[PDB]
Amino acid sequence: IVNRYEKLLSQRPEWHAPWKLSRVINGHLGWVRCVAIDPVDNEWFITGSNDTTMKVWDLATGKLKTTLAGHVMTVRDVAVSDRHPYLFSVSEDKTVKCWDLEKNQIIRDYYGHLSGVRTVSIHPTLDLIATAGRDSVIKLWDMRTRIPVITLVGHKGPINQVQCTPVDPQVVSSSTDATVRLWDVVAGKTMKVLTHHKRSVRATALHPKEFSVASACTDDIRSWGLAEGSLLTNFESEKTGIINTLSINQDDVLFAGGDNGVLSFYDYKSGHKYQSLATREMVGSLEGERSVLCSTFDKTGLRLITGEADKSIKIWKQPGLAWNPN
Amino acid sequence: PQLEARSGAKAAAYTPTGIEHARLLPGHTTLKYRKF
Amino acid sequence: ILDLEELREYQRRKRTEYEGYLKRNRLDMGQWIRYAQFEIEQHDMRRARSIFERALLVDSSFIPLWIRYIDAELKVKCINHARNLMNRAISTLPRVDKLWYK
Amino acid sequence: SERKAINKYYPPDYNPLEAEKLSRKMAKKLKTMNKSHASIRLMTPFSMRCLECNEYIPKSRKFNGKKELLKEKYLDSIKIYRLTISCPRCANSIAFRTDPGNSDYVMEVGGVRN
Amino acid sequence: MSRNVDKANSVLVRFQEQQAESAGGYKDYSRYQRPRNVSKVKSIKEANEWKRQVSKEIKQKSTRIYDPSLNEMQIAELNDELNNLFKEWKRWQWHID
Amino acid sequence: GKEVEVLMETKNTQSPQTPLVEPVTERTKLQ
Amino acid sequence: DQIAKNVKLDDFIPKRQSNFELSVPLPTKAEIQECTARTKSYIQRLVNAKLANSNNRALLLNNSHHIEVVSKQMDPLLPRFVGKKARKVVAPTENDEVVPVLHMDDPNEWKIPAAVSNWKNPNGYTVALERNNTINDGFMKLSEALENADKKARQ
Amino acid sequence: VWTNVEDQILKAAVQKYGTHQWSKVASLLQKKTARQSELRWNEYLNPKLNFTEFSKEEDAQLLDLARELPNQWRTIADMMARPAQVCVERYNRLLEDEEKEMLAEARARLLNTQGKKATRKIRERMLEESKRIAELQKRRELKQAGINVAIKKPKKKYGTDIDYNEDIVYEQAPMPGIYDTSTEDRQIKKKFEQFER
Amino acid sequence: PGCGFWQPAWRVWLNFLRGTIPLLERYIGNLITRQFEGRSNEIVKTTTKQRLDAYYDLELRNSVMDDILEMMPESIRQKKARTILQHLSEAWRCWKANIPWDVPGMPAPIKKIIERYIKSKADAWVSAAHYNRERIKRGAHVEKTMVKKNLGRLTRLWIK
């Protein structure tokens, strides 16, 4: 309609600074298909991989702190907790393990997932984590009693990212069924099922200050306030690659990594793509490989960290692009 | 043949068994915390 | 297939076979439609209807299943039910062209 | 309960000789043990054609045969055996004999070697 | 004593069977061959059991003889076997009681 | 190539610097 | 009309596209706390129940009429939960309300061939045989060096 | 030494089997060897190899190569895109019953997509079918007596899919609901009673 | 013979029994529970040496399939999934052999993705092989089968 387009044209987005590559830390001998940082501090960030390991990394130096070898198969995801000094990690060996960070050694392997487990999210407020695998089910664990407390049946296929919010919409799943769910853990049921994607929403992330949750199928990055479970915006992601990552920055600077490796940045809520970045790879590696598989920002937000399939981790420092809608 | 690949996994909830698994046994009841 | 009992035996066997094939490849959707067709042929409309529903539940995003089901509903001059089914389909999937057209 | 079991339990009254005698008495009556064509598992050395349906059962192919004693021995004190087989497709009873003069077998109205 | 038959006809098992027969009267009329000449069986129960066994055998024969490769000679042979079985059954229905 | 070129540093990291036993977080509470 | 009711237009519409200053508020601290309490209580309760269920050690009314419920101490030898026996149970989905599954909107390239392995044929399905020149200066130069050398040696 | 029928068979096998599976093929040709078979294939059988002759320029090139890679002949062949022995030759320049039987065997092999498990299963099915028909026949014979058809014995609590209705999913109560459907169903069922009769 | 003084031995046995009490209560108790109510849906565990590799392969396959799904539109995609899997397998085989896996109909993107995953596999595989070799060199509880595999794999690598 003309009534909306005109309005869109009238409104302007804020000039977010562009992004330039800063650090590249070829250290893993495998994909680096998870990355995470400490809520409390931003000194280190760990990165689980197809190595089977996960390595810890000092941001400032870029130096490899230490390794951790508590899986058999490849690590798919990790989550350092704000409220406790535990690092949860999870691998396609079906193990959702829990590393003490006072001793850097596993403690509570949680057992229950029938098959390769894709993501963890620690609940920001509770002493409870949430994991989901190709199982097609998101189980919540009491961390003390290392048992699945509840489980969330709804989904009809493998479930990827499964973020935890502190409100009522306490889990924000995202499947290959292309539904992204909002659940009520307490009710033992769904509350609202965002079906707006076309394909496997293989990426989703909570906004820090804004109580919303960007989510990405093969192209269209939707983003939504999950209070009602209502759409907020659609991003200009029109011919970008298969969106692997979908991290959001503190300053409303949503990042999206592709299977292409084209690092695409967007103003959040606007839905305005305001940068593209061509990937890079090593002289030995192939041009098809290069692809940002996992990524996240620091708590401040000036450094984006992208794990790419070059067996690398690339950290990114910081005139905006013209609007032009449909 | 029946040596066959696959399409999808599963997750169906039954009545719990009440079996005393070895790992499930208590351990690390104390959760640590952060300073703040 | 002379007697009623014989027919029942045959039919039962067929049903069992279908079930067996489903249990493995639940997410197939060709098998399901075949099963539905068989049911229709047998002139047990309930059973056929159930099968179609089950198939839909398995894979809601599969237009062929929907369309075949609709056809089946219409075939038995059971229009109102068919209409309802169509409506349901529409509700499920607006942005598919075909259901609306149908 | 375990394949390498040292001692099988016997009742408190088990006169072993007496037991044996009893068994013998109830061996003529017995169905199995008082019969011929006792089963066996064997691979086929000849590699031959099933004469009915021409199914080319090759060398070393495994079958659940029936071994039976041929009363007419070779020479004097070295026995020879009929070794029944079935063709996979058609259920024709193939068999062969083990005449040890040539250190090899003889076909017995079942199939032909090739 | 691989393949189960040997185990079944192992001496211990036989002894056990004998014991059972002696005390309580457990026979397995499956296990022994049915006698050729009837009227060497004064007991009725035994006779009945034998009859039952023969009936079972007949049934078994019947089940197999309607197989798809009907032109094979085994089936033909069985037809005579079936007849024999029937005859036996008839005989077993003697009129002493 | 471009990761190598310009001002942006590539760090090759085989060896972990900080030891394996040492903690990644500590919890001291009263002397 | 019913169909219309079932699926509405505002679902397809993003809400922020019209109003940018509009922001979803980060939830109230008190509210958050309450939520935590609710879930914490519930999850704790669930865990307790689970523990109780595990076989290792360590009032009501019907109609108008009032009725006292009790729990008798069963003998500690007999199975605690004599009801349960590890039964398979298929459940119905029971989804009465209809999920709206909304969306928006070269074929010869995206089509992928049917490859045939040089190592494997599951079915044994036969198929009609579906199964640089420049060399470096050295390879001439070397030869020249060699032959010439040989000639020299000879002469 | 290689006969032509045998060669043909080998070629056929290769299309059936796989140019990296030289045991089965060897077996198929009773006299020729596994490692030999592969060699033979490399030499003659594979179409992509240009066994045929070529122009003068090519010949010249070959000779040049020969001069400058002293009889490193496989390499030369590779460079050419030609086979080796033929190239070398060029450079230099400048019973019935058995056949019948083997062919029969080979034909049987290549055609039949079968083995133990494939053959057994179908056969078993056929047997089952036969049994079922026999049962039916028996019941027909004893029709004047009241006879019931034997059910498939259950193994661990399964459903007989005649009765009970199997795991039903709903009709889903909609808005334009009309009660003629039931009537229609009844009508349909009426006919089947007649059929049964 | 005739030395009494069974006390310390007795004490030792008592103490041994203490340990058992617990173990037996889990074990025997568990058994009896099973007998009354015998388990529903057990979950195997890939941290086992056995089954690890297969599981990994399966996971990889799944990932590849997902990627392909993400890539482009399809109608009746189930059938195509199998084909994709087959292609992947072929590619892997080629890599193992050191044959270039060039198929003309394979479209650039899909092909590229397949190549990337086979590279990943190789990385995972080669490294694993190396590790195994190292273990063997040390004398560190290698499986006979595992050792054989290493010998084979390593040979293949060498050839490549």
Residue H81 has a CB neighbour count (10 Å cut-off) of 13
Put simply, the answer to whether A72 touches I47 (Cβ < 8 Å) is yes
Q: Distances from the Cα of A320 to the Cαs of A12, A74, A221, A303, in angstroms?
A: 11, 39, 20, 19
D14 belongs to an annotated ligand binding site: no
Substitution target in A246, A281, A289, A291 with the highest count of I β-carbons within 10 Å is: A289
Strands (E), chain G: 60-62, 65-67
CB pairs under 8 A between C and G: 31
Cα separation of H25 and H10, whole Å? 6
Put simply, the answer to whether H127 touches E62 (Cβ < 8 Å) is no
Inter-axis angle of helices C4-24 and H117-141, to 10 degrees?
160
CB pairs under 8 A between D and H: 8
Measure H180 CA to nearest chain C CA, in Å.
Answer: 8
Residue A59 DSSP symbol: T
Cα separation of A241 and A258, whole Å? 5
Measure C57 CA to nearest chain G CA, in Å.
Answer: 8
Contact D20, E11 (CB under 8 A): yes
Put simply, the answer to whether B18 touches I29 (Cβ < 8 Å) is no
Residue C15 has a CB neighbour count (10 Å cut-off) of 22
Contact residues on chain A for G35, CB-CB shorter than 8 A: 125, 166-168, 170
Contact residues on chain G for H117, CB-CB shorter than 8 A: none
Backbone angles phi, psi at C14, to 5 degrees: -60, -45
Put simply, the answer to whether D56 touches H116 (Cβ < 8 Å) is no
Q: Which residues contact E15 (CB under 8 A, 6 or more apart)?
A: D14, D19, D22, D23
Cα separation of A116 and A105, whole Å? 22
Cα separation of E62 and E68, whole Å? 13
Cα separation of A319 and A325, whole Å? 18
Q: What is the DSSP string of A164-180?
A: E-SSSS-EE--BSSS-E
Longest CA span, chain E: 50
Residues in chain A: 326
Q: Checking phi first, is residue D97 left (phi over 0); if not, alpha (psi -120 to 50) or beta?
A: beta
* Buried b / exposed e along H138-151 (16+ C-beta atoms within 10 A): ebeeeeeeeeeeee
User: Helix (H, G, I), strand (E, B), or coil: what is residue H45?
Assistant: helix
Residue C27 has a CB neighbour count (10 Å cut-off) of 15
Nearest CA in chain A to I119: A289
Residue E16 sits at the vertex; the CA angle it makes with E10 and E19, to the nearest 5 degrees, is: 140
Q: G with A: 3 or more CB pairs under 8 Å?
A: yes
Q: Which residues contact A149 (CB under 8 A, 6 or more apart)?
A: A128, A140, A141, A142, G43, G46, G47, G50
- The owner of tokens 């594979």 is H46
Cα separation of G118 and H17, whole Å? 8
Of E3, E8, E18, the CB nearest to D22: E18
> What's the domain count of chain A?
1
G100 touches chain C (CB under 8 A): yes
Q: F with D: 3 or more CB pairs under 8 Å?
A: no
Contact residues on chain G for B24, CB-CB shorter than 8 A: 54
Cα separation of E53 and C31, whole Å? 45
Q: Which residues contact E21 (CB under 8 A, 6 or more apart)?
A: E27
Closest CA to A277 of A304, A297, A249: A304
Contact residues on chain E for H133, CB-CB shorter than 8 A: 66
Q: Which residues contact I32 (CB under 8 A, 6 or more apart)?
A: none
For residue A121, list its beta bridge partners.
A130
Output the CA torsion sign for A285, I70, A297, A185. Answer: negative
Q: Distances from the Cα of G44 to the Cαs of A143, E14, G29, G40, I3, in angstroms?
A: 11, 62, 22, 6, 59
Q: Extract the tokens encoding C42.
A: 């047998």
User: Helix (H, G, I), strand (E, B), or coil: what is residue G61?
Assistant: strand
Residue D111 sits at the vertex; the CA angle it makes with D106 and D114, to the nearest 5 degrees, is: 75
Cα separation of A159 and A176, whole Å? 6
Cα separation of F3 and A23, whole Å? 9
> What's the domain count of chain E?
1
Of H126, H129, H134, the CB nearest to E63: H134
Residue D60 has a CB neighbour count (10 Å cut-off) of 8
Cα separation of D81 and D66, whole Å? 10
Q: D with A: 3 or more CB pairs under 8 Å?
A: no
Q: Extract the tokens encoding I118.
A: 């086979």
Residue D88 DSSP symbol: S
Contact residues on chain E for H131, CB-CB shorter than 8 A: 63, 66-67
Chains linked to C by 3 or more Cβ pairs within 8 Å: B, G, H, I
* Buried b / exposed e along F6-30 (16+ C-beta atoms within 10 A): eebebeebeebebeeeeebbeeeee
Put simply, the answer to whether A242 touches I124 (Cβ < 8 Å) is no
Residue A124 has a CB neighbour count (10 Å cut-off) of 18
Q: Extract the tokens encoding E29.
A: 């009329």
Helix (H) or strand (E) holding E74: helix E73-92
Q: C with H: 3 or more CB pairs under 8 Å?
A: yes
Q: Which of residues 153-172 of H touch C (CB under 8 A)?
A: 159-162, 165-172
Measure G112 CA to nearest chain C CA, in Å.
Answer: 20
Residue C54 has a CB neighbour count (10 Å cut-off) of 19
Q: What is the DSSP string of chain I?
A: ------HHHHHHHHHHHHHHHHHHHHHHHHHHHHHHS--S-----TTSSTTHHHHHHHHHHHHHHHHHHHHS--SSHHHHHHHHHHHHHHHHHHHHHT-----SSS-HHHHHHHHHHHHHHHHHHHHHHHHHHHHHHHT----HHHHHHHHHHHHHHHH-
Contact residues on chain G for I104, CB-CB shorter than 8 A: 113
Measure H156 CA to nearest chain G CA, in Å.
Answer: 11
User: Do strands A36-37 and A44-48 pair parallel, antiparallel, or not at all (unpaired)?
Assistant: antiparallel
Of G53, G80, G89, the CB nearest to B16: G53
Put simply, the answer to whether G119 touches I93 (Cβ < 8 Å) is yes
Nearest CA in chain H to G145: H68
Cα separation of F7 and A22, whole Å? 8
Closest CA to I77 of D15, A25, G110: G110
I85 touches chain B (CB under 8 A): yes
User: Do strands D62-69 and A292-297 pair parallel, antiparallel, or not at all (unpaired)?
Assistant: unpaired
D50 belongs to an annotated ligand binding site: yes
D59 touches chain H (CB under 8 A): no
Contact A33, A293 (CB under 8 A): yes
Q: Which amino acid is at B34?
A: R
C27 touches chain B (CB under 8 A): yes
Strands (E), D1-114: 38-43, 48-50, 56-57, 62-69, 81-86, 93-94, 96-97, 106-107, 111-113
- The owner of tokens 């703040």 is B36
Beta-sheet strand order (sheet of A253-258)? A243-245, A253-258, A263-267, A272-277
Longest CA span, chain B: 61
Contact C97, H195 (CB under 8 A): no
Closest CA to A60 of A298, A253, A252: A298
Expressed as residue numbers, the domain containing A277 is 1-326
**Resolution of the solved structure (Å):** 10.0
- Tally of helices (H runs) and strands (E runs) in chain A: 1, 28
First-to-final CA distance of chain E: 44
Put simply, the answer to whether G24 touches A198 (Cβ < 8 Å) is no
User: Helix (H, G, I), strand (E, B), or coil: what is residue G70?
Assistant: coil
Of G85, G87, G110, the CB nearest to I107: G110
Substitution target in F27, F28, F29, F30 with the highest count of B β-carbons within 10 Å is: F27
Cα separation of E43 and G32, whole Å? 88
Q: Distances from the Cα of C91 to the Cαs of C99, G2, G59, G100, in angstroms?
A: 10, 9, 47, 6
Residue C21 has a CB neighbour count (10 Å cut-off) of 15
- The owner of tokens 């084979």 is I152
Of D22, D32, D34, the CB nearest to E15: D22
Q: What is the DSSP string of E6-33?
A: HHHTSHHHHHHHHHHHHTT----TTTBP
Of H136, H162, H169, the CB nearest to C6: H136
G99 touches chain C (CB under 8 A): yes
Q: Extract the tokens encoding E80.
A: 């005579």
Interface residues of chain H, partner chain G, Cβ below 8 Å? 12, 14-21, 47, 67-69, 79, 81, 110, 113, 167-170, 172-173, 175-176
For residue A272, list its beta bridge partners.
A267
Q: What burial class does residue E45 get, using C-beta atoms within 10 Å of its C-beta: 0-12 exposed, 13-18 middle, 19+ buried?
A: exposed
Q: What is the DSSP string of A286-302?
A: -TTT--EEEEEE-SSSS
For residue A183, list its beta bridge partners.
A171, A190
Contact residues on chain C for B8, CB-CB shorter than 8 A: 26-27
Put simply, the answer to whether F16 touches A280 (Cβ < 8 Å) is no
Measure E61 CA to nearest chain D CA, in Å.
Answer: 17
User: Helix (H, G, I), strand (E, B), or coil: what is residue A82?
Assistant: coil
- The owner of tokens 């829990």 is A98
Of I25, I29, I40, the CB nearest to B17: I40
Residue I55 has a CB neighbour count (10 Å cut-off) of 21
Closest CA to A134 of A97, A92, A188: A92
Q: Extract the tokens encoding G108.
A: 């010869």
Cα separation of I95 and A171, whole Å? 42
Residues in chain I: 160
Determination method here? cryo-EM
Q: G with B: 3 or more CB pairs under 8 Å?
A: yes
Return the percent helix, strand and coil in chain D, to nearest 5: 10, 30, 60
Of D56, D88, D114, the CB nearest to H108: D56
D19 touches chain E (CB under 8 A): yes
Nearest CA in chain H to E67: H130
Q: Extract the tokens encoding I29.
A: 């108790």
For residue I143, list its beta bridge partners.
none
Half-sphere exposure of H105 (CA within 13 A, CB side): 22
Q: What is the CATH number of the domain that holds A36?
A: 2.130.10.10
Expressed as residue numbers, the domain containing E28 is 1-97
